[PDB]
Design a protein around this ligand. Structure first.
Ligand SMILES: Nc1ncnc2c1ncn2[C@@H]1O[C@H](COP(=O)(O)OP(=O)(O)O)[C@@H](O)[C@H]1O
Ligand SMILES: Nc1ncnc2c1ncn2[C@@H]1O[C@H](COP(=O)(O)OP(=O)(O)O)[C@@H](O)[C@H]1O
Ligand SMILES: [Mg+2]
Ligand SMILES: [Mg+2]
Lengths: 371, 56, 371, 56
């Protein structure tokens, strides 16, 4: 039979059968209970709208993501999300399909063990396998080397790989991602008068960020230009009218990636953690990693980031090496495409964690040889 | 009685006419909605071309 | 058995069995004791004529409404009105019929508790339920969202509802209604020479208001036109002859709704309290409320109000939103039609306040789960 | 007499409604014409761009 390539993610759940080009169903991972009282009788009001249904009734819900930073903080809601994904968005019972979840690097063990225990006890799948979210993004590019920066919505991690041999001592995981950029944008919009507070209006700020923000090639020059002319002010229409005008908030929101001091984080930007991740590698594979830097994940879709990052790394790196940044147009679904490719391989067909194996060793089987 | 019949006939015609006008304005409002969708789509496509060209 | 859908109102009591299209008996709610001496013996003169009987002998009575502004100020008279409604206008003993009263929003608790105590002790009904007068008017329109402006004769209230979830923090109750318009019309008629003082002549002024007054589309232009031409002066024949001619009093009486400063009230008109009630709602359900504005209640029957209100709200609201005002021809009985529909539902059949429940918790049961 | 008064009032209401509807439909037609004018202007600009791109 065919395998189910699910990809929990944090912000958008992407799923679909193995062997295709794009995920079949992509929908936000939010579960929102209603918060008001409700007076109409017999309206058929449910107790929790999940997935894309709660992005249409969000006016009277309190949306809450079940995955904070890669890790899962609310297991009941995550179980509800998985149940919805299997039964309503794909309509395939899990009793007859292997599953291939994905997990960020350096995550707590208990999260992974609970994930496999749920998949084997509640949904009762035949066999499931957990894979690191960066190796798949490297599969999708058709490479076999390269250092991949997978800046998702929950957590940004940077896994270097050479000739198929991952370097476990050079993984640099940073917890700045799309959600923190949304919060920072929502916080700097208040400088013009627009106040978004409700958890429903966070979605509106996210839409503003997606449609308007861009990464500046040079930050100081843009700050000077936006403060003199008015060629940058782009307007946007809220879900009820009252258009708003975003000035130099456009390139200040995604600039947080390269200067995490804006949101008070100490660490260095995504332009310098990649160079540090390279320098921890051996001295003989640094040229190949320099030449095959891969971008993935949703948050790396800002217009103009593949040039800013290249300029920064070229500034840091030695002058002789060639710096090349692979930015495929299908960046958002790169991890899932790689997952489909991996699940479609014949050599991989014996790596699944078969159910009888789980019955013999318990949930701690995932840390064992079947990784 | 004759005057009542005349007034009732004219009022009924007026009701029919206002129904026709409301249907016509519904049709033209729908057409304007379609053209507004057209402009939204064309501006979105132009913005997509702009971001693709600026971002290569 | 069948349920009794009574609707106390203030000015007209509307009642009838559940499941029909129109109330069975509609009659003014006035109780008038005779005031003169009375010399004929054996004429069979009663001590209080209630309902529609006191609108025919009003020449020698002192009519007094038992409901001032939603609240009930004279409990003995209200009990008399209910007794008349049950026994003479419907001729069904209350011992064998559930009742569904209606109550304005934000009313004093003691009024509701006394109402249920009367219904359970004096008339001894099997089970009664109290419902907010706006949710029913929303039932009758066949909608499930929308903001309903129920401008009755006692009190005008504006309850917004979305997807069946009422928003308790956005109810704007204003005490200007048909009665104040009657008093203001009676006060401005004195500018031509016609003086109505007796409580019986208030009914004549009410008839004048119903038959002649209309809401102007633009107030200043109408004031200018009525002051130059004479195409507006419509005449009306009193109950004894001596026709009167109403000039620009025609559209000045109902204009008080949109400018409550005429009768000295501070608050804003019904055109601006609706917009304020909308703006208190969340940012994502404002479009639906804009598109589904519902009118109900008797006082919204003025010829030309559904256009003036739409023009005013379109002036206030953002230019992109579409403003639509639902004004069904059966506006007056909209609340009662909705009450019949609600009482006819199977899902609602277990929400009644059963008598044994009242015996166990006292009259304060109404504020509890059985709302 | 009661019936005649009812009919006359109905006629006046319907006439006023038809007047309002006519004015509104004319205004909306004007708005649609304006948006079509904007679309045609940008379309002619893009057509000039295509004429130059023929040399591109
Ligand atoms: N076109 C875009 N432009 C800018 N940011 C985007 C765009 N699309 C998605 N994002 C950001 O990326 C996030 C989605 O990232 P995604 O790759 O789905 O995360 P995950 O790894 O959990 O699947 C969104 O929250 C949004 O903030
Ligand atoms: N055809 C009409 N035109 C204008 N005003 C009316 C009309 N019918 C009723 N009214 C006004 O509405 C009041 C009746 O309102 P109603 O809806 O019966 O109040 P309630 O909510 O108490 O039932 C009357 O007092 C009268 O002033
Ligand atoms: Mg991801
Ligand atoms: Mg009422």
């Amino acid at each position: 039979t065919t395998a189910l390539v699910c990809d929990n993610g944090s912000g958008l759940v992407k799923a679909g059968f193995a062997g295709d080009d794009a995920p079949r169903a992509v929908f936000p991972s939010i579960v929102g209970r209603p918060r008001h009282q409700g007076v109409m009788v017999g309206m058929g009001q449910k107790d929790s709208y999940v997935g894309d249904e709660a992005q249409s009734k969000r006016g009277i819900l309190t949306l809450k993501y079940p995955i904070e930073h890669g890790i899962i903080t609310n297991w009941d809601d995550m179980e509800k999300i998985w149940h919805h994904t299997f039964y309503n968005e794909l309509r395939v019972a899990p009793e007859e399909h292997p599953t291939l979840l994905t997990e960020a690097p350096l995550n707590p063990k208990a999260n992974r063990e609970k994930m496999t225990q749920i998949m084997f006890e509640t949904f009762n799948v035949p066999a499931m396998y957990v894979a690191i979210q960066a190796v798949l993004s490297l599969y999708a590019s058709g490479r076999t080397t390269g250092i991949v920066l997978d800046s998702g919505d929950g957590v940004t991690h940077n896994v270097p790989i050479y000739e198929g041999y991952a370097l476990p001592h050079a993984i640099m995981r940073l917890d700045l991602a799309g959600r923190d950029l949304t919060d920072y944008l929502m916080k700097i919009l208040t400088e013009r008068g627009y106040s978004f507070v409700t958890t429903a209006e966070r979605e509106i700020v996210r839409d503003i960020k997606e449609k308007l923000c861009y990464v500046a090639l040079d930050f100081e020059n843009e700050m000077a230009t936006a403060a003199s002319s008015s060629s940058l002010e782009k307007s946007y229409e809220l879900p009820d009218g009252q258009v708003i005008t975003i000035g130099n908030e456009r390139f200040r929101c995604p600039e947080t990636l390269f200067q995490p001091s804006f949101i008070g984080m100490e660490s260095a930007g995504i332009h310098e953690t990649t160079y540090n991740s390279i320098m921890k590698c051996d001295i003989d594979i640094r040229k190949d990693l320099y030449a095959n830097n891969v971008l993935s994940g949703g948050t790396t879709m800002y217009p103009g980031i593949a040039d800013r990052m290249q300029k920064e790394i070229t500034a840091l790196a030695p002058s002789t090496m060639k710096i090349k940044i692979i930015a495929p147009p299908e960046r958002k679904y790169s991890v899932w495409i790689g997952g489909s490719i991996l699940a479609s391989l014949s050599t991989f067909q014996q790596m699944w964690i078969s159910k009888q194996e789980y019955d013999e060793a318990g949930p701690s089987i995932v840390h064992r040889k079947c990784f | 009685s004759d005057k009542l019949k005349e007034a009732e006939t004219r009022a009924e015609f007026a009701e029919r006419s206002v129904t026709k006008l409301e249907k016509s304005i519904d049709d033209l409002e729908d057409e304007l909605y379609a053209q507004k969708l057209k402009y939204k789509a064309i501006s979105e496509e132009l913005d997509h071309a702009l971001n693709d060209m600026t971002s290569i």
